[PDB]
Amino acid sequence: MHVTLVEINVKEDKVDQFIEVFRANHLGSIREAGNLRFDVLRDEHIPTRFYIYEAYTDEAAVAIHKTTPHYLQCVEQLAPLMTGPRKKTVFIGLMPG
Amino acid sequence: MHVTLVEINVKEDKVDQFIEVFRANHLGSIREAGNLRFDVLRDEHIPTRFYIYEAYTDEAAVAIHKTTPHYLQCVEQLAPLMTGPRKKTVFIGLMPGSLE
Ligand SMILES: [Cl-]
Structure with a gap:
């Protein structure tokens, strides 16, 4: 089980759009x-x-996630909403296991 | 959800005891x-x-958790296991929630 915690810093005037983007993701x-957790x-x-x-069964499922239309659209729409790059910690x- | 992430550094020779304690918790x-996640x-x-x-439905559920035998055994047994103090983050x- 592959887990990641990703920190995202969002432009104050874009929070509403950020929430919409992540609802879809x-x-x-x-x-x-x-997927096990999101x-x-x-x-x-x-x-x-x-x-x-986010948690996935294994790294193969993570790779699958990164192919999905919803993930790819999120990555596109999120870019301008952010004040800096994402930070990611892997665990x-x-x-369970 | 009431959510927390706790970091614990375990003494090398105490990892098995840490697993036994956390398995029961x-x-x-x-x-x-x-409880929603553990x-x-x-x-x-x-x-x-x-x-x-760890995630719980609300503050009453967190409080309930902290009265359970499994939590309390974890608390008792935890100091001999660690190299330094735990670090806790609340989120x-x-x-899932109304914002979905
Ligand atoms: Cl000892």
């Missing part, structure tokens, strides 16, 4: 055969800092 | 009606660094 991603989180104190907790799942 | 927690993760590279990702859970 979340909806598509939770429907994928190899949680959208906010920083406890920074209103424009979000974290996406390996132990439980 | 994981099992009991996923049997809590108010994922036990490990660092990509550092063999003794673990993370626990605001937006999806």
Whole structure:
């Protein structure tokens, strides 16, 4: 089980659009055969800092995710909404397992 | 969702005891009606660094969790296991939730 936590910093005046983009990504991603989690989180104190907790069965499912129309559209639409590059931390799942 | 991520560094010779403790915490927690996630993760590279990702429906459910035998056994047994103190991050859970 492959997990990633991705930090995204969003332009204050674009939060509404960011939420729309991630609603579409979340909806598509939770429907994928190899998806296990797709949680959208906010920083406890920074209103424009979000974290996406995504987990997939394995790295093959991650690769599949990155081929999907919803992921590719999100990557496109997210780019201008952000104040800087995404930061990603990878983890390996132990439980469930 | 009330969400937290906790980082724990475990003494090399205590990793097995850490797994025993977290297995029981994981099992009991996923049997809590108010629990939504209890994922036990490990660092990509550092063999003794673990993370626990936990989510609960609300603050009452977090509080319930902290009264359970499985949590309390974890708390008791945890100090002899670690090299230094745990680090905890709290997150605001937006999806799944009304924002979906
Ligand atoms: Cl000892």
